[PDB]
Amino acid sequence: ATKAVCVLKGDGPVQGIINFEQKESNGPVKVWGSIKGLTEGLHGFHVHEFGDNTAGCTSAGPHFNPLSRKHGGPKDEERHVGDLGNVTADKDGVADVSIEDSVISLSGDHCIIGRTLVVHEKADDLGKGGNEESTKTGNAGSRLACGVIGIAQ
Amino acid sequence: ATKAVCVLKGDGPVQGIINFEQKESNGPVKVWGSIKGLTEGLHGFHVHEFGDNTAGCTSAGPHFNPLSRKHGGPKDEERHVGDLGNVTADKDGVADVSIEDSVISLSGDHCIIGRTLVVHEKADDLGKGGNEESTKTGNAGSRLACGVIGIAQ
Numbered sequence: 001a002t003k004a005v006c007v008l009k010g011d012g013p014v015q016g017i018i019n020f021e022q023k024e025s026n027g028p029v030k031v032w033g034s035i036k037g038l039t040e041g042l043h044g045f046h047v048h049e050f051g052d053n054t055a056g057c058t059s060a061g062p063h064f065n066p067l068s069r070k071h072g073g074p075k076d077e078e079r080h081v082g083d084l085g086n087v088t089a090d091k092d093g094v095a096d097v098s099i100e101d102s103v104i105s106l107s108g109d110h111c112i113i114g115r116t117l118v119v120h121e122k123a124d125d126l127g128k129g130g131n132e133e134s135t136k137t138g139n140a141g142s143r144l145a146c147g148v149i150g151i152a153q
Numbered sequence: 154a155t156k157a158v159c160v161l162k163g164d165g166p167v168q169g170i171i172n173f174e175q176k177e178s179n180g181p182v183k184v185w186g187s188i189k190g191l192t193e194g195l196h197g198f199h200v201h202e203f204g205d206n207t208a209g210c211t212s213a214g215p216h217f218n219p220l221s222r223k224h225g226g227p228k229d230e231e232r233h234v235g236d237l238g239n240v241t242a243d244k245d246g247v248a249d250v251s252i253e254d255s256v257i258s259l260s261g262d263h264c265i266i267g268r269t270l271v272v273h274e275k276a277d278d279l280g281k282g283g284n285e286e287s288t289k290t291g292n293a294g295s296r297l298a299c300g301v302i303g304i305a306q
């Protein structure tokens with residue numbers, strides 16, 4: 001696959017659409033779109049392991065972490081594959097997302113297709129928060145919206 | 154992987170959960186679960202090509218058809234890889250889904266992870282109807298509910 005897409009929804013007002021593009025096998029992945037209904041500020045943004053929304057976003061499990069690393073930010077060597085950092089909303093509640101990432105993929109063992117993208121209640125501290133949870137979740141709190149990442153046209 | 158899941162959502166509520174299991178990559182896929190909120194009778198049931206719900210189930214495109222075949226039933230050689238036939242709802246509006254299929258897969262070129270499962274308004278005629286559409290869509294009509302197929306734990 002070269003293109004993927006995710007519709008983010010949850011139980012509250014947070015909703016969005018996120019697109020992915022990967023031009024080349026083993027090249028970087030462009031990630032772009034918009035999320036609305038958010039509180040102003042940073043909100044953690046990750047790919048979680050399972051594309052399972054059976055009981056809502058909780059069913060998606062932990063961060064996608066095929067290489068058994070600690071949590072980090074997207075520009076860290078020490079990160080989960082799924083660690084895409086934060087999106088940032090304005091007072092208007094909108095986060096415009098524009099990310100390139102070279103660790104996620106749309107094929108192979110780092111593939112994110114069929115997994116869940118999640119936007120969080122709180123900021124992700126990118127593993128620099130100095131408690132144990134920082135190293136696992138980034139202290140980003142509950143899951144406000146999510147969706148399964150699908151193959152796109 | 155060897156398990157996948159799909160949450161179907163549409164107006165009614167037409168709602169359902171479908172589980173997938175494939176014991177080995179060269180093996181059949183067990184498909185099972187429940188869909189509620191349906192009218193009594195047969196409803197077409199297929200994997201569509203794109204895991205895109207941007208604008209609702211319409212965004213998923215046509216039946217998943219990597220081999221460029223005509224529409225058929227699941228037992229037919231001439232079928233789309235996505236052709237899973239019909240589910241049947243009782244007077245209570247529930248369809249008990251219990252399928253094994255050897256053409257879909259959870260890995261490889263026929264993988265359905267990241268694609269959309271759809272349940273339709275009307276019966277699928279399994280390509281045996283009296284017109285040209287039968288060999289494309291089975292005449293199953295609109296899309297009552299769908300979801301993106303994700304990797305499960």
Ligand SMILES: [Cu+2]
Pocket residue numbers: 044045046047048063118119120
């Ligand atoms: Cu997350």
Ligand SMILES: [Cu+2]
Pocket residue numbers: 197198199200201216271272273293
């Ligand atoms: Cu269909």
Ligand SMILES: [Zn+2]
Pocket residue numbers: 046063070071072079080082083136137
């Ligand atoms: Zn992480």
Ligand SMILES: [Zn+2]
Pocket residue numbers: 199216223224225232233235236289290291
């Ligand atoms: Zn078909």
